[PDB]
Structure formats: structure tokens, C-alpha cells
């Protein structure tokens, strides 16, 4: 990889995009050497990993280099010069006063990821590099910007469009279960994945389901158990080495969107070309055999309306200050920033509350921001029941959700700011009730 040969890539202001083919050692071979070079040069270095899995892998790889691995609170005077942490950890640390450090070189792995923390993190680092405050290395097979759904790969890939079950199925689709070898099947949602997994197990196949909720614990089981099928959301687009020879890819994704002041989860969108390329990129890792990519439909690069962009600006605005040059999203993504930069910045005490809601109460950035903006006492939960009547939340039995406050009054779950992701897709209304009731 020529651009990172020598030391030119380490000069302040240099931004390097490393777009190696999947399976070519980006994370497990190149990145560690990069870090050792920085450590040898005595340069303060930041290494960002997409997930805990990768973070502990990176840890391992840096076996001679003195690093401080951050597995979000706290600060030490121990004095290692390389810090390694997840994308979200970087953002969350910068929400607090004690967490706003500076590094001369920053290396971000899986830098395409469209979780808002990742978007915010690469935006902040890009903005710092544009101000000549650090060097920046973005490592990803699908750099944000132009892209091809069928990029080059180390091994041959047969790509074929076929009808794919929209959940369970009862007859046909025999090619699914006749396949000898292991498959990764991408689904748009946890809900769809549960349906797909149910049929596969009924047909005698072994299945592991991966999503945002299960990935850090169950991804490790894939190597150990070698399931017939990995049924996965887009969470596997971010470094997961699933060790399959076929991908099944409906090319859809859930579509969280703020509509009429609420974040809705209705329907799906066709995936972006980058996303499609990452899904397809689970196979073709080596030469030898010919892998398969079975898909359905076309891509849709226009993801501008998704709530992720707003959430990324919410996060970026609160890890930057009003003073100094204005931050942006990473290059071509700036088009998708929904307001003028700084719009969502909170004062220091509201930001502390904002951070708590995300890190201790599992709130989305969108919901944490609205609560932090509009509430003054962190113990006041009345906003969870003082919303409009169309924000009433159905419980598991389809009835209203009733709960008691500590004083004994009975309330109906009906938030002022309604984020459907808090009651679906890996989050359970029962845990929100724990918050609303003041437990």
C-alpha cells in the first residue's frame, strides 16, 4: 500500500484513504505496523476501532507497542502515547471536559460506517486535519463518495439476482437450503432476521443471528461453531469476518427517519452502493474457489433523509466548540449535514445529561438531545407521559403502557419526543419503563 510507505502520511494536514480489497490484512497486518511506526517515532497516536471485538483484536496485535486501550470515563497520568478506542468511545469521551485530548496522528478503521458516532468521529478528525492539526488515515474498502456495487476482490465472485424470501417462506427457494457451504444472509431489521432464522432452523440449518444488540457477544461464536447461516443486519458491514462462501443480500435496510417530529421505523429502503459493496465484500476474500453473491434489486445512494445525519451533527456539534474554525462532516458527506454547524451544541451541563442518557440509559442521540435540550432537572420524568395522544406506546399485550411514579400516581407511557427505536429493534419498552418510573 504505497501511500503509507515511508513517513509522508504522518505529516500534519495529510489525509490518506486506504482502500484495500477485503481480506488483505487492513486490520490485522497493516494497522499494527502503522501504529508501531508511530510509536517508534514518538508521535501521539489515536487508533479508532468500529467495535469491541476489533478493539480487543487490535489490542492483541499491538503486542510490543505501549498503548492505552480504552475498553469512556476517567483519565490517567500513566503516559502511554498511543490510545486505542472504539468510534463511539472517542465521541463520548469528548462530550465531557476531561475527555478532550489531542493527537498528532489519527487512524480510523472501517471509516465508512454510518452509525452517527462514526460519522461524527471521521468528521471531527477530517476537520482537525484540514486545520493542519493532525494527520488522518481512513481505512475502508468503501470510502465515502463515489462507489461501485461490484468492486474488485481478491477472489472471483458470481453475482446473481434472485428472488429472496421477505422473511419466512413455505415452498420454493430451494437453492437456499441445497447449498453446500456456509452463507451470510443480510436482512434489513432484527424483526426480519428473526423470521428468516425461524425458517432456516425449521429446515434443519444451524443459525447465528447478528445485529447491533448481539454482535459483541455472538460474533465470536461464528468462528467457533461455523453455523450453516449467519443471519445478520448491516452490523456485519464493519469488519466482520464471517468465513462464508455465499452472501444472500435482499439489499434493503431499515429506514429511521424523523417525520413530523417523531422518529419512525416504517418500511425499508434499498441500500446504498457502499452498503451493497460491503455485504458482497464478505466473500471473494481469497483466490481459489468462486464465491457467490445472491442479491435482489438495485441500490439507492440517496440516504439524505435518514435520521443518522441529524444524529451525527448532534454528536459533532457537542464534541466541538463555537471557537475556532467550523467543523464539517468528512468531505463528500458534508452535503448531508442538515443544519448549519453548531446548531445542536449544548451548554456544558446539558451535554453532561445528554451523555448520561446515551451511556447509562441507552437513549438514541436524537432522543437524548431532545430531552437534554428541553429539561432542567435530570430527575423529572414527566416528559415520558406529557406528550400528545398519538405518542401513546402500546405494550406487549397491545394495551396502553401503565406505570406508577415513585409517589404512586399512575401514568400512561406517552412521550413528548417519540423515537420508535426505543421500543423496537433490540430495545424493550420494559427498560424504558424503568427510566420513566424513576427506578
Swiss-Prot record:
It is a peripheral membrane protein. The record marks 279, 282 as: Involved in NS3 ATPase and RTPase activities. Residues 172-330 form the Helicase C-terminal domain. Residues 7-161 form the Helicase ATP-binding domain. ATP binds at residues 20-27. The modification N6-acetyllysine is found at residue 213. Acetylated by host KAT5. Acetylation modulates NS3 RNA-binding and unwinding activities and plays an important positive role for viral replication. A motif (DEAH box) lies at residues 109-112. Residues 1-439 are lumenal. It is found in: Host endoplasmic reticulum membrane. Forms a heterodimer with NS2B. Interacts with non-structural protein 2A (via N-terminus). Interacts with NS4B. Interacts with unphosphorylated RNA-directed RNA polymerase NS5; this interaction stimulates RNA-directed RNA polymerase NS5 guanylyltransferase activity. Displays three enzymatic activities: serine protease, NTPase and RNA helicase. NS3 serine protease, in association with NS2B, performs its autocleavage and cleaves the polyprotein at dibasic sites in the cytoplasm: C-prM, NS2A-NS2B, NS2B-NS3, NS3-NS4A, NS4A-2K and NS4B-NS5. NS3 RNA helicase binds RNA and unwinds dsRNA in the 3' to 5' direction. This is Serine protease NS3. It comes from Kyasanur forest disease virus. The lineage of its organism: Viruses, Riboviria, Orthornavirae, Kitrinoviricota, Flasuviricetes.
Amino acid at each position: 500500500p504505497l501511500s503509507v510507505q515511508g513517513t509522508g502520511w504522518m505529516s500534519k494536514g495529510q489525509i490518506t484513504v486506504l482502500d484495500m480489497h477485503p481480506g488483505s490484512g487492513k486490520t490485522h497486518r497493516v494497522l499494527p505496523e502503522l501504529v508501531r511506526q508511530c510509536a517508534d517515532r514518538g508521535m501521539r497516536t489515536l487508533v479508532l476501532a468500529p467495535t469491541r471485538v476489533v478493539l480487543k483484536e487490535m489490542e492483541r496485535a499491538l503486542a510490543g507497542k505501549k498503548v492505552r486501550f480504552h475498553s469512556v470515563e476517567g483519565q490517567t497520568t500513566a503516559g502511554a502515547i498511543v490510545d486505542v478506542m472504539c468510534h463511539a468511545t472517542y465521541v463520548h469521551r469528548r462530550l465531557l471536559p476531561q475527555g478532550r485530548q489531542n493527537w498528532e496522528v489519527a487512524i480510523m478503521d472501517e471509516a465508512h460506517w454510518t452509525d452517527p458516532h462514526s460519522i461524527a468521529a471521521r468528521g471531527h478528525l477530517y476537520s482537525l486535519a484540514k486545520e493542519n492539526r493532525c494527520a488522518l488515515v481512513l481505512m475502508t474498502a468503501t470510502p465515502p463518495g463515489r462507489g461501485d456495487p461490484f468492486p474488485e476482490s481478491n477472489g472471483a465472485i458470481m453475482s446473481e439476482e434472485r428472488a429472496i424470501p421477505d422473511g419466512e417462506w413455505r415452498e420454493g427457494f430451494d437453492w437456499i437450503t441445497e447449498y453446500e457451504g456456509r452463507t451470510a444472509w443480510f436482512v434489513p431489521s432484527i424483526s426480519k432476521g428473526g423470521a428468516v432464522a425461524r425458517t432456516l432452523r425449521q429446515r434443519g440449518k444451524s443459525v447465528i443471528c447478528l445485529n447491533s444488540k448481539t454482535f459483541e457477544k455472538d460474533y465470536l461464536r461464528v468462528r467457533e461453531e461455523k453455523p450453516d447461516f449467519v443471519v445478520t443486519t448491516d452490523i456485519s458491514e464493519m469488519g466482520a469476518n464471517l468465513d462464508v462462501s455465499r452472501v444472500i443480500d435482499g439489499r434493503t435496510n431499515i429506514k429511521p427517519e424523523e417525520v413530523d417530529g417523531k422518529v419512525e421505523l416504517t418500511g425499508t429502503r434499498k441500500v446504498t452502493t457502499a452498503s451493497a459493496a460491503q455485504r458482497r465484500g464478505r466473500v471473494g476474500r481469497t483466490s481459489g474457489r468462486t464465491d457467490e453473491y445472491i442479491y435482489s434489486g438495485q441500490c439507492d445512494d440517496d440516504d439524505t433523509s435518514l435520521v443518522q445525519w441529524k444524529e451525527a451533527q448532534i454528536l459533532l456539534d457537542n464534541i466541538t466548540t463555537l471557537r475556532g474554525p467550523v467543523a464539517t462532516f468528512y468531505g463528500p458527506e458534508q452535503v448531508k449535514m442538515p443544519e448549519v454547524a453548531g446548531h445542536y451544541r449544548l451548554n456544558e451541563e446539558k451535554r453532561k445529561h445528554f451523555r448520561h442518557l446515551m451511556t447509562q440509559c441507552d437513549f438514541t442521540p436524537w432522543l437524548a438531545w431532545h430531552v437534554a435540550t428541553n429539561t432542567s432537572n435530570v430527575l423529572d420524568r414527566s416528559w415520558t407521559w406529557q406528550g400528545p395522544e398519538e405518542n401513546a406506546i402500546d405494550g406487549a399485550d397491545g394495551d396502553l403502557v401503565r406505570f406508577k411514579t415513585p409517589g404512586g400516581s399512575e401514568r400512561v407511557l406517552q412521550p413528548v419526543w417519540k423515537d420508535c427505536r426505543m421500543f423496537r429493534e433490540g430495545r424493550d419498552v420494559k427498560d424504558f419503563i424503568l427510566y420513566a418510573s424513576g427506578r
